[PDB]
């Protein structure tokens, strides 16, 4: 009976959850179902054997509204909201320019980045962009990111530093990621007084 | 229907509503939307009295002047975004 | 005379619809039964006359309304109503014996003699069809519809085609009232048959045949819960066919529109099995735990009458909180997460043993494992959790309460 | 004076992020476009208009 005394659980019995809890649960449910969704997977499941080229059909023009008019037939063939198509394609075409040849990047890594980041603000204006969907589809590309790119993001305001650093699942991952990239960038910025200016800007920011 | 403009349903009952034009669209298939180009303002009602009978029982019509809810909400949103952007 | 019964009909009908629209659990039922007995007495008074013609359409409407009331209040059918139908048919045919299928065809020939009642008749056939569909009489049902339409429809042996073919005959002109008409019938019939057909073809491993009928359900009359079920079903079909991303969207949509999302999380975990995303599996089901804790009718035919209950083989069946906490802890342990599966089994063991005051959890029965096996699984969870001293307490409690399980208890006790 | 400006800076900032979240939920069909969103925006309009445009 001391056996019972040790074994017995008290929290066991429960009640019928509150309605706000109901929508919280359903919210987190859909959140997780989308967290585990993936888009090249769907392009190859639904469509036969993602980048702005995959959307806009072979480099026709870098115009603004043309991309937008395509994304609609994209999300219509799929069933997704357009904002997530946009977030994923842009996370991908961000990993592209960070990767394809330190804590910094410069010329043409900047130019294509800004040719596309400008277009991001156009789609924000038309509301055809999801913003946490983009924070999370960047954290899928976690380590292929540049501290200068994310600061360009912070400053052109497609995303805030805080909308990133509260949207990462793991917090220790964030902390250490940032610690190492800081340590590397402060080993930088004494390399030359020109590198120093752009590094000091983002440091004090 | 008209084949070049198939977002239209001219009505062809050979009675009283004849001549009438309609449309239909459907976003989140609960929250639909309808538009009438009716002759005068009796065959703007007779429509509704014929219809709202037919519906589901909580089907909650309303009239519009200023724009659809989602559109107008986005439109307010955009102004507020810009405004606070400028004030920032 | 006819004036009086007609007024009576319309009176009670409006009374019924008022109880539908307004009223509380008390007064709805009170007015309902008052109207129901009014209808009973009226029906019998009408049976008090031998056969004559002008009463028939009114008579039929009346019995129809009666049945509708009766099954709407019962929330389930009975063959007393089949006897009511039998009786009416004989009442009719006496103008001009054997078995229902003969009755129906003779009666359809009798109506093909064109007495203006066929709206009523078609409503009634819808009713009888609803009976035969809750009863799974699909064979004779097909023959009946073939007789309803021309016999040229002899080879169209898919019932959905004949359902589409059944033309409700009239615009229902100035008439005795009704709670329902052949149109509102036909829609409910189409959706229910398509839903049953689709579930059977899913369970029998035909997730390609399934999708045709499942989308045919959502395309047409479909109350929000019916939508939730159809979407869970399409997601499961997509899992069988191997579309592990496509299924997620349909489940997400059932989450959005539904307030009843146990089966969705179930199918989601069934898909994280398929993908080995077992962290997503376990978390979806940890959510399902809380999901199952959570919780109107009408005086009319609905689409909840003509559903079979959730069978285990169907993806929409859900174990109780305890049944499914068992699966949580089980699959947790199988994943190799004993520290968590052990606490799961602890709370689950107290859910049954400490359950005296509140609602007592239902017994597992023959399909579920017998109560002692869970003690062994709990002790093994504790042991792999290094919870040895308390595993001894569990063993002592077990042998206090009361085979292979005794020796197993000895073994786990030694292992502690 | 800087004192006033920093207050207004942060006080607008917070509302901005709130609206940004609400726009996200609009894009994703998350809460609803139904109603009371309307009122929740007009609340913001009314937090703005009161000392609107002090011209000094």
Swiss-Prot record, chain A:
Q: Where in the cell is it found?
A: Nucleus; Cytoplasm
Q: How is it modified after translation?
A: Phosphorylation is required for the formation of the nuclear complex. Not phosphorylated in cells derived from groups A, B, C, E, F, G, and H.
Which residue ranges does the UniProt annotation give for the motif Nuclear localization signal? 1-16
Q: What is the top-level taxon of the source organism? A: Eukaryota
Q: Which disease is it linked to?
A: Fanconi anemia, complementation group A: A disorder affecting all bone marrow elements and resulting in anemia, leukopenia and thrombopenia. It is associated with cardiac, renal and limb malformations, dermal pigmentary changes, and a predisposition to the development of malignancies. At the cellular level it is associated with hypersensitivity to DNA-damaging agents, chromosomal instability (increased chromosome breakage) and defective DNA repair.
Subunit details: Belongs to the multisubunit FA complex composed of FANCA, FANCB, FANCC, FANCE, FANCF, FANCG, FANCL/PHF9 and FANCM. The complex is not found in FA patients. In complex with FANCF, FANCG and FANCL, but not with FANCC, nor FANCE, interacts with HES1; this interaction may be essential for the stability and nuclear localization of FA core complex proteins. The complex with FANCC and FANCG may also include EIF2AK2 and HSP70. Interacts with FAAP20/C1orf86; interaction is direct.
UniProt name for this protein: Fanconi anemia group A protein
Lineage at the top is: Eukaryota, Metazoa, Chordata, Craniata, Vertebrata
In the UniProt record, the gene name given for this protein reads: FANCA
Q: Which residues of the full protein are shown?
A: 19 to 237 of 1455
From Swiss-Prot, chain B:
Role of this protein? DNA repair protein required for FANCD2 ubiquitination.
Parent-record interval covered: 684 to 771 of 859
Q: Which organism is it from?
A: Homo sapiens (Human)
Subunit:
Belongs to the multisubunit FA complex composed of FANCA, FANCB, FANCC, FANCE, FANCF, FANCG, FANCL/PHF9 and FANCM. The complex is not found in FA patients.
Tell me where in or outside the cell this protein is found.
Answer: Nucleus
> Which disease is noted in the annotation?
Fanconi anemia complementation group B: A disorder affecting all bone marrow elements and resulting in anemia, leukopenia and thrombopenia. It is associated with cardiac, renal and limb malformations, dermal pigmentary changes, and a predisposition to the development of malignancies. At the cellular level it is associated with hypersensitivity to DNA-damaging agents, chromosomal instability (increased chromosome breakage) and defective DNA repair. Some severe FANCB cases manifest features of VACTERL syndrome with hydrocephalus.
Q: What is this protein called?
A: Fanconi anemia group B protein
Q: Which superkingdom, per the lineage?
A: Eukaryota
Upper lineage: Eukaryota, Metazoa, Chordata, Craniata, Vertebrata
From Swiss-Prot, chain C:
Gene Ontology molecular function: any one: damaged DNA binding
GO BP, sorted A to Z: DNA damage response; DNA repair; interstrand cross-link repair; mitochondrion organization; ovarian follicle development; response to radiation; spermatid development
Instruction: Give an example GO cellular component term for this record.
Output: mitochondrion
Q: Where is the signal peptide?
A: none
Q: Which UniProt keywords apply?
A: Cytoplasm, Disease variant, DNA damage, DNA repair, Fanconi anemia, Nucleus, Phosphoprotein, Repeat, TPR repeat
Location(s) in or outside the cell:
Nucleus; Cytoplasm
Is-annotated flag, keyword DNA repair? Answer: yes
In which tissues is this gene expressed? Answer: Highly expressed in testis and thymus. Found in lymphoblasts.
Keyword Nucleus (UniProt): yes
Q: Where are the TPR repeats?
A: 228-261, 322-355
Q: How does it assemble?
A: Belongs to the multisubunit FA complex composed of FANCA, FANCB, FANCC, FANCE, FANCF, FANCG, FANCL/PHF9 and FANCM. The complex is not found in FA patients. In complex with FANCF, FANCA and FANCL, but not with FANCC, nor FANCE, interacts with HES1; this interaction may be essential for the stability and nuclear localization of FA core complex proteins. The complex with FANCC and FANCG may also include EIF2AK2 and HSP70.
Function, as annotated, reads: DNA repair protein that may operate in a postreplication repair or a cell cycle checkpoint function. May be implicated in interstrand DNA cross-link repair and in the maintenance of normal chromosome stability. Candidate tumor suppressor gene.
Q: What name has this protein been given in UniProt?
A: Fanconi anemia group G protein
Taxonomic source organism? Homo sapiens
Identify the coding gene.
FANCG
**Part of the intact protein present:** 12 to 462 of 622
From Swiss-Prot, chain D:
Subcellular location per UniProt equals: Nucleus
Source organism superkingdom: Eukaryota
Q: Spell out the disulfide connections.
A: none
Physiological role:
Plays a role in Fanconi anemia-associated DNA damage response network. Regulates FANCD2 monoubiquitination and the stability of the FA core complex. Induces chromosomal instability as well as hypersensitivity to DNA cross-linking agents, when repressed.
Q: How does it assemble?
A: Belongs to the multisubunit FA complex composed of FANCA, FANCB, FANCC, FANCE, FANCF, FANCG, FANCL/PHF9, FANCM, FAAP24 and FAAP100. Forms a subcomplex with FANCB and FANCL.
Entry protein name: Fanconi anemia core complex-associated protein 100
Q: Which organism is it from?
A: Homo sapiens (Human)
């Amino acid at each position: 009976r001391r056996a019972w005394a040790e074994l017995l659980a008290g929290r066991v019995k429960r009640e019928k959850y509150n309605p706000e809890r109901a929508q919280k649960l359903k919210e987190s449910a859909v959140r997780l179902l989308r967290s585990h969704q993936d888009l090249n997977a769907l392009l190859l499941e639904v469509e036969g054997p993602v980048i702005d080229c995959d959307s806009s059909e072979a480099y026709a023009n870098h115009s603004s509204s043309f991309i937008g008019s395509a994304l609609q037939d994209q999300a219509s063939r799929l069933g997704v909201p357009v904002g997530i198509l946009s977030a994923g394609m842009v996370a991908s075409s961000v990993g592209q320019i960070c990767t394809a040849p330190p804590v910094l990047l410069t010329v043409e890594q900047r130019k294509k980045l800004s040719s596309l980041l400008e277009f991001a603000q156009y789609l924000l204006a038309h509301s055809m962009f999801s913003r946490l969907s983009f924070c999370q589809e960047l954290w899928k590309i976690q380590s292929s990111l540049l501290l200068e790119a994310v600061w360009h993001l912070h400053v052109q305001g497609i995303v805030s530093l805080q909308e990133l650093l509260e949207s990462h699942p793991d917090m220790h991952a964030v902390g250490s990621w940032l610690f190492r990239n800081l340590c590397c960038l402060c080993e930088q910025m004494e390399a030359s007084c020109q590198h120093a200016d752009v590094a000091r800007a983002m440091l004090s920011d | 229907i008209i084949k070049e403009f198939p977002e239209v349903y001219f009505c062809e009952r050979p009675g009283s509503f004849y001549g009438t034009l309609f449309t239909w669209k459907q976003r989140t298939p609960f929250e639909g939307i309808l538009i009438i180009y009716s002759r005068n303002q009796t065959v703007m009602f007779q429509c509704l009295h014929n219809l709202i009978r037919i519906l589901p029982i909580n089907c909650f019509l309303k009239n519009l002047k200023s724009g659809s809810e989602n559109f107008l909400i986005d439109n307010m949103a955009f102004t507020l975004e810009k405004e606070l952007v400028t004030l920032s | 005379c006819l004036d009086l019964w007609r007024e009576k009909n319309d009176r009670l009908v409006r009374q019924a619809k008022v109880a539908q629209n307004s009223g509380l659990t008390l007064r709805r039922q009170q007015l309902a039964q008052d109207a129901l007995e009014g209808l009973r007495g009226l029906l019998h008074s009408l049976q008090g006359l031998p056969a004559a013609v002008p009463v028939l359409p009114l008579e039929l409407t009346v019995t129809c309304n009666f049945i509708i009331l009766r099954a709407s209040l019962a929330q389930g059918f009975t063959e007393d109503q089949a006897q009511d139908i039998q009786r009416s048919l004989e009442r009719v045919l006496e103008t001009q014996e054997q078995g229902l299928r003969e009755l129906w065809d003779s009666v359809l020939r009798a109506s093909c003699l064109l007495p203006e009642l066929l709206s009523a008749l078609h409503r009634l056939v819808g009713l009888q069809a609803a009976l035969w569909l809750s009863a799974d009489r699909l064979g004779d049902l097909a023959l009946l519809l073939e007789t309803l339409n021309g016999s040229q429809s002899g080879a169209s042996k898919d019932l959905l085609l004949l359902l589409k073919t059944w033309s409700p005959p009239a615009e229902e002109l100035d008439a005795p009232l009704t709670l329902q008409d052949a149109q509102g019938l036909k829609d409910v019939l189409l959706t229910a048959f398509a839903y049953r057909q689709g579930l059977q073809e899913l369970i029998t491993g035909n997730p390609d045949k399934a999708l045709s009928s499942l989308h045919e359900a959502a395309s047409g009359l479909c109350p929000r819960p019916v939508l939730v079920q159809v979407y869970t079903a399409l997601g499961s079909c997509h899992r069988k066919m191997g579309n592990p991303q496509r299924a997620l969207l349909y489940l997400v949509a059932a989450l959005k529109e539904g307030s009843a999302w146990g089966p969705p999380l179930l199918e989601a975990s069934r898909l994280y099995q398929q993908l080995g995303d077992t962290t997503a599996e376990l978390e979806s089901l940890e959510l399902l735990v809380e999901a199952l804790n959570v919780p109107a009718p009408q005086f009319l035919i609905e689409v909840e009458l003509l559903l079979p209950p959730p069978d285990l083989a169907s993806p929409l069946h859900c174990g109780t909180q305890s049944q499914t906490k068992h699966i949580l802890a089980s699959r947790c342990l199988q994943t190799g997460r004993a520290g968590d599966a052990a606490e799961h089994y602890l709370d689950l063991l107290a859910l049954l043993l400490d359950s005296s005051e509140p609602r007592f959890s239902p017994p597992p029965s023959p399909p579920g494992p017998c109560m002692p096996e869970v003690f062994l699984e709990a002790a093994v969870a504790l042991i792999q959790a290094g919870r040895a001293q308390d595993a001894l307490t569990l063993c002592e409690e077990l042998l206090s309460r009361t085979p292979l399980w005794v020796s197993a208890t000895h073994l786990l006790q030694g292992q502690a | 004076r800087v004192q006033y400006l920093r207050q207004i800076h942060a006080n607008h900032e917070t509302l901005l992020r709130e609206v940004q979240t609400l726009r996200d939920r609009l894009c994703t069909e998350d809460e609803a476009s139904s109603c009371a969103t309307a009122q929740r925006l007009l609340q913001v309009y009314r937090q703005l208009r009161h000392p609107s445009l002090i011209l000094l």
